[PDB]
Design a protein around this ligand. Sequence first.
Ligand SMILES: NC(=O)c1ccc[n+](C2OC(COP(=O)([O-])OP(=O)(O)OC[C@H]3O[C@H](n4cnc5c(N)ncnc54)[C@H](O)[C@@H]3O)C(O)C2O)c1
Lengths: 101, 151, 101, 50, 473, 51, 16
Amino acid sequence: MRNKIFISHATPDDNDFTRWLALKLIGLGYEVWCDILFLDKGVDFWSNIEKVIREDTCKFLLVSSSYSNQREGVLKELAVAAKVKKQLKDDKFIIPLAIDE
Amino acid sequence: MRNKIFISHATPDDNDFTRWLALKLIGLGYEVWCDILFLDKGVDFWSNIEKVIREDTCKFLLVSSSYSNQREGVLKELAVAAKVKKQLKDDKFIIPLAIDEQLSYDDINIDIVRLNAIDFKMSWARGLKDILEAFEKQKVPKEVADASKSN
Amino acid sequence: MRNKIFISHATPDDNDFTRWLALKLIGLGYEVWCDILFLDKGVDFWSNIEKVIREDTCKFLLVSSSYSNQREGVLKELAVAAKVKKQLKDDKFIIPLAIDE
Amino acid sequence: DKFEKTMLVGKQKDKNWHFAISGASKLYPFPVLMISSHIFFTADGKKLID
Amino acid sequence: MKELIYIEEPKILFAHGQKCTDARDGLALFGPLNNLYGIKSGVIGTKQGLKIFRDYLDHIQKPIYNSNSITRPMFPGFEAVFDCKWESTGITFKEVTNEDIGKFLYNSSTHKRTYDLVSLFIDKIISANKNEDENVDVWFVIVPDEIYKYCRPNSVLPKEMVQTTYNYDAQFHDQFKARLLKHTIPTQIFRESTLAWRDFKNAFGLPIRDFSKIEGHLAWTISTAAFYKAGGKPWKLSDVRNGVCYLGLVYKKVEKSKNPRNACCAAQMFLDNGDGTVFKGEVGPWYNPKNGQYHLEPKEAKALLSQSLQSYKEQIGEYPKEVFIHAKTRFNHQEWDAFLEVTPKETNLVGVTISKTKPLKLYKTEGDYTILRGNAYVVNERSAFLWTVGYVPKIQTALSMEVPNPLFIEINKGEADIKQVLKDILSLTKLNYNACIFADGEPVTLRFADKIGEILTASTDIKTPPLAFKYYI
Amino acid sequence: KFLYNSSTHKRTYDLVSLFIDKIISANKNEDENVDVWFVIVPDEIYKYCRP
Amino acid sequence: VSNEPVKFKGNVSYNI
DNA sequence: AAAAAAAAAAAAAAAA
Ligand SMILES: NC(=O)c1ccc[n+](C2OC(COP(=O)([O-])OP(=O)(O)OC[C@H]3O[C@H](n4cnc5c(N)ncnc54)[C@H](O)[C@@H]3O)C(O)C2O)c1
């Protein structure tokens, strides 16, 4: 069953906020998945990310900033999230986060 | 039982980093196989490489650099490693180690492009601790730490 | 110069459509590279594919089917195509072709 | 400018170099005569550089 | 034909108790003895010279390669070698404007110019030490090169830019580090050229200080000094015997007081309870009148030896069983007459004289390589020759360039086993913490004693100076 | 040795010296670097080292 | 004074 | 004012 919270973000730039949020959610008892903490070394990263979004992702958290708007890597995860939103029939699947003023 | 770590690389070009990494891993209690580790060479070496890769290696580390990117020995070792990966049904088998700043991730070999690579470009020790975390997360066989073995 | 069209596909499953498309495109005057085209194989083809994709391919056609969707060789070729697309600064590089209903 | 088979006075750009020694007799370890090695340079082969 | 005996190469100790002949390779694989969480570094200098320091620090964060890895081991990066954080993020910067530098620089009086240039740096360093929240382990002083050009004795400032104290020595480094003794601030002076030298060029176009082939060793020897000055133990001796104090005595002149007054300074090493080695200065500088006597009066000698013995009691509990006083000079009988009075019965006092004066040079008959390091021609039971500078296979080369000269070692008085004496001086040649090299050509006692003597004789107003070497080197 | 003294001023001065001299010797005459010096003092001192 | 220098003897060697 | 036999202060070059 799906009990994960994919905190998608811009990998090089938004590391600090994403790590803080992931640690806070883990401390509260929420299972969290993110590349900088939970992605395995020496594994097919897009295949693993797609499997996580499609199968075990309970809810999708997008960290939206000036970097994460036109970032192709985050957009691909966002598209997969939209597809699995359609499949799961849950309008409240994707919760964007605005951190950049 | 598979309990050995294979470090493929370019022998006359990437020797310093492989030496450091192997001597650190064996110091930490990890069994390491590398061509530069063993002293003397004979015609049996080439067959022994495939034999150890297919029979004893539990994790395959490929030193990624502008030298070892497209080297025939490295390519052959990577191909047999990929076949062993398919046979063992273990996705986390080939673990690239990117050590060259002029080797951007967009110019890596085809077998390695789709794999998460431990970044050694900025700090070797950060790469080493990432290698560790990967090892105890994936439960790589390990013996108690002993620096005297490396010495 | 880049004047060859690369057609990625699943070798043991999508031979019919790939054959028809390649034989049509070649007749139409388009240079086509595909693995079912060349007769005989050797160890060199693994590097041949990468060098053709990175140095000669002008368009990358991905035969999209339930077989080719999650095929390891197809995924590797697609990743190299994505890297080439990033390098060439040409968005209209990968042109997927969906043939499965 | 070479005794035996080895040069002792040579050329370096406009300066002619010479192999030189200095002498010193000592009697502590054995009765011995110590020799040191120096190199001096001349512009014409006869007058030392001041 | 006379026999030469070779001393086994002493081994230094590293983390986990592992032994390794080479210090560079020992740190590269085993790391330092104690865990220093991080080097919180403060840098003082021109804002132009801050960029250079930041670039060099980020550069040494990454591994650095020499030309020939066999002769010179490569540098695996600071935090990998030392298990210590030293980043360019978190450096306290105290700006030194170029106009203030030029205000002092363009002065005719070299003494006053050096005094003012040193004062400009030390005032800001002390202000940051006293009136700032930030804690700095070590203060990296980034000096420009025109300073070094015109801030030392016998340096003539050209007439064209001369635009315009005598109690202090005109050496920038010596007098600088002498004025910080009251505050105990570890500092590391860098030339601006010693840093990213590729900027500074000559007329021909090749850099004046070319370290292109030896950049890795430059990183090794800068990193080791930075680590030591922050309170780390890079390596340690393992062949030292229990109960042997050594002491290294060197005489330096003082040009300020009338008559050079021949200031004496001492550096001490012994073993401590456990296994730790205690290598601290023994500094009570005992001034000796007369121009060139170089032999201390009985009062000063007794005070020196009593300070040496008490500095051993308070750390071990009881007197050393064998004290091996080294010295560049042979002593007169009055000095041992002084020493023996305070010297107790159980302690064995031996005086050792080491000299580079005697011109013996063993040339090998075949090959363009020098004699092996360690060869010792023992003249008799008291005197010997020791080749501390020479060929050693591990570095693949010799430590000298031409044919080296050995160290003349002799036992003035005392008894001493001459082989044991040669077996300890070679051990003393490895503990040079100011440089990350294979070994030193002279024992560290006579070199660090010389350094502290060169620092203590730059300022006249020293009183109860620190004994720690991180404030001196 | 210092605490059992009737003169409070000499007691406190000598007791302060007993700590500060060791701390100063550690700061000046030791290779190790310490950021902050923690001074653990017993309870009889607080009973008998104040006005 | 002898024209050939005093010769010594070492039991320890090496190779390039 | 010589000598031999013993002293440090200072500056330049080159790898280390
Ligand atoms: N292993 C990873 O860190 C990794 C890999 C792919 C994508 N991403 C992700 O990228 C996102 C959006 O940012 P982006 O568009 O800049 O993606 P991106 O691929 O450009 O990520 C940039 C960072 O990951 C890259 N990366 C790390 N390992 C790699 C490898 N083995 N092969 C190729 N690249 C590697 C770069 O090193 C770089 O540091 C995400 O939200 C996300 O999860 C991360």
